[PDB]
Amino acid sequence: QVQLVESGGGVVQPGRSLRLSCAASRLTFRNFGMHWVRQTPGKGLEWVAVIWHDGSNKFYADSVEGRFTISRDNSKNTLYLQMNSLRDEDTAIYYCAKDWGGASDRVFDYWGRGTLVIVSSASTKGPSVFPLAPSGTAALGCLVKDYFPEPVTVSWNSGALTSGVHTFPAVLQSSGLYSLSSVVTVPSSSLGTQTYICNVNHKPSNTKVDKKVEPKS
Amino acid sequence: VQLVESGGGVVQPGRSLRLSCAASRLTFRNFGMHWVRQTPGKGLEWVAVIWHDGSNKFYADSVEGRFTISRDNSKNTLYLQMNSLRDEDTAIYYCAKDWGGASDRVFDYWGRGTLVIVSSASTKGPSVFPLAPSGTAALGCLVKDYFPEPVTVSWNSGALTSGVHTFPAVLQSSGLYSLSSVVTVPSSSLGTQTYICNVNHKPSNTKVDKKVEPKS
Amino acid sequence: NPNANPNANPNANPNA
Amino acid sequence: DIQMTQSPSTLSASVGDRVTITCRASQSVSTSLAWYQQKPGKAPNLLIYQASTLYRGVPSRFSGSGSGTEFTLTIGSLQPDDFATYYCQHYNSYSRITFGQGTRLEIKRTVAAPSVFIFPPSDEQLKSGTASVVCLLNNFYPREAKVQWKVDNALQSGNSQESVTEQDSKDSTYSLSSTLTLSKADYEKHKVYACEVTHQGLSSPVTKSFNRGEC
Amino acid sequence: DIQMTQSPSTLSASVGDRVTITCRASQSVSTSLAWYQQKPGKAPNLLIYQASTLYRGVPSRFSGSGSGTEFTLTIGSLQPDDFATYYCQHYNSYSRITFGQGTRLEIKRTVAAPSVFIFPPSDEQLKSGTASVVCLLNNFYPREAKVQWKVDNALQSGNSQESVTEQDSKDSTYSLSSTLTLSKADYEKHKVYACEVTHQGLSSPVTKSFNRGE
């Protein structure tokens, strides 16, 4: 089966460069034009660039014209994407895509797993945890604020509490830092006898924090 | 000019198979060569083409990344490496010679063909069930649950041929084939003449004689 | 045309 | 990829007629087009290429026509040797080769209504755990017939397969088989089994019936 | 470039139903249009190209039609596998490829009212000079929910953010979380902090409220 594997993503600062690469396997690579498509955090899709089988022609989306450069090497079955002058707006998952081969149809049949590109001026910072105290069912939870970059994983009582748990998707604040909340619905009977602790993990900052959530004084 | 395909047979899904086509009485290195397959629906579909020196290879959309075409001019032979076989690959596979014209991708010479069946089923002999007649009567034999094709049915060891309709086999959800064979005879002969169908499945080495007797 | 056919020609002359 | 569609799918003619079949493409193929003849059990044979060039050895009664998206194959006077299936094939530049689904030329004859027979599952197959009911349509023309199974006069759908013979060569008729297969559990949970055959040669659809376990 | 707008953004349906989603282009594209299916954590999958042609291996229950500026994707009868997000894409000659914003196909279920909770900022977060009030809506359906913040019975705007989960696999409900973030000095210049929830499953708008200091 045809396989595409992208590489070279990461967290980069605005205004700097980053080269993406996509390795093809089990495919007559030199026979097909190749595209790049990206997916913004809002799940919108955006075509980036196309290159012809021999590299004789290249086209770009108006948003990346002059800053991005697509190229390929048929002897190594590798597609490239040189990105320069990167902005926050370029934050996306970048797929390399194979042109279907239909002469009339610029559709993509095979996609790679994608590679993540975060454009941020923010530095790797661990999260601050604050409790949402509860006061015949009650809702309590943890506020996980101002961390970078994604993701964090939230568990409750080291995984022994799965039911009624909701870990909301992270939201990006105006400071360039991410925040989320995780909440659990529990029996109002249980608040004075059982202890509830969230277990936030932020692997980029080597962070493993716990916080006991009890009703307010 | 001569083309003969080989390497066909039964292969389980996901496995691989390598076909070969031996060209004779032809300067093989001078021509591009194709593979063309034909599904049980009788639809033709181009599979691949290789240039005269392997300089280029082009593939059908449905096999790109799983089939590999190659050639050995020193042996006058065409190869086709088939990997990750699906049920949709079950077909007759012909090697075809490109005509030689610059602007016409047409096939002037073909091989006899080779059949590739993608199936998890194992070799099974058929069960032969009678179709009992109830001025012209109808009787027959239901040949069921066998793999692979084909079987051959006679009537009265071949002495009865007029009025015989042996239907093509159909593939069942079980992955086994099954067919019918019927014959129209005079109803005056039901109590007098004996009717036996002779079923043979050479992949199973099974020979079955079934007497079809009238019903009350 | 940015959406013109970017792929190779599979029906080009393959013979000697 | 380019879609090749052939009109009609089957064409009835008699020896000596002038026959034309057509091939329409999804987009223009210029004149990069070929025609093949194929008979059962044999590889295809080249007839026409570049839309209208006769292949050496092909009888001159064959000729191709057309440009862009619409094409024709014409047989000036149909010989008894030309009853076969005919395929078109494009090789337009920068397009992967495609074949049409084919057109079968079949021998013309008068209408012949089918003889209908039904067969309950044998006692032997009932010792097996599966029950196959078979309806036989013998020596009919034209080939288009509709068979329907009604179990307790409930219409059945999706539990039957049919099989059609090649056109007979003595009388040019067709015969058809329809096998309805059930579990033995489902076969014994119903009483009346029938096939109802609709065909051009029948005034009304004739129905053959039987009941399970009864003479 | 050409703007592709899909209608609607979220379609509610049950297995067996027939669903149609619309794609509209800001200028004509003829038939140069494709439909994709995408499931969370994966790349898109091709379904239809040239407006109406089924891609190989796609089930026959997918169909497509249209030409010019309006196109529709239709699923003859839904299967569990068909719940996902669908994008239209054009490739009109001399026009750079653009995609629709996508349509989310969710499972239909009976209406469930949200359980609304409000949480004041903890004492340790205030010590950092920032206050974030949280309004929680748990296990509701359908997805449309209006959360209006009211500080001192004055409708707020532009100082909050909402986070909603995906449709839960177990009960097909949603959960929403709105975060009102204020300055510590701005937080203690006001008394009443309430969020007002408007949902189809509530006869009234419900208001959860607290008074700073209690």
Author numbering:
A (entry chain H): 1 to 52, 52A, 53 to 82, 82A, 82B, 82C, 83 to 100, 100A, ...
B (entry chain I): 2 to 52, 52A, 53 to 82, 82A, 82B, 82C, 83 to 100, 100A, ...
C (entry chain P): 2 to 17
D (entry chain M): 1 to 95, 95A, 96 to 214
E (entry chain L): 1 to 95, 95A, 96 to 213
Please quote the authors directly.
The repeat region in P. falciparum is composed of 1 NPDP, 3-5 NVDP, and 35-41 NANP repeats. In this work, we characterize eight monoclonal antibodies (mAb) derived from protected volunteers who participated in a phase 2a clinical trial of RTS,S/AS0131 with a delayed fractional dosing regimen, and compare them with three previously published mAbs derived from the same clinical trial.
Therefore, mAbs 239, 337, 356, and 399 with higher fold-changes should also exhibit Fab–Fab interactions on binding multiple epitopes on the CSP NANP repeat region. The presence of homotypic Fab–Fab interactions in mAbs 239 and 399 was validated in the crystal structures of Fab239–NPNA4 and Fab399–NPNA6 complexes. Two copies of Fab239 form side-to-side inter-Fab contacts, which are mediated mostly by the heavy chain. The interaction of HAsp31 (Asp residue 31 from the heavy chain) from CDR H1 with HGlu64 from CDR H2 is also conserved in the Fab–Fab interfaces of Fabs 239 and 311. Therefore, these similarities suggest that Fab239 may also be capable of forming a long-range spiral structure, in which multiple copies of the Fab simultaneously bind to rsCSP27. Unlike Fabs 239 or 311, Fab399 is not likely to form a similar spiral conformation with rsCSP27 because such a structure would not accommodate the symmetric, head-to-head, inter-Fab interactions.
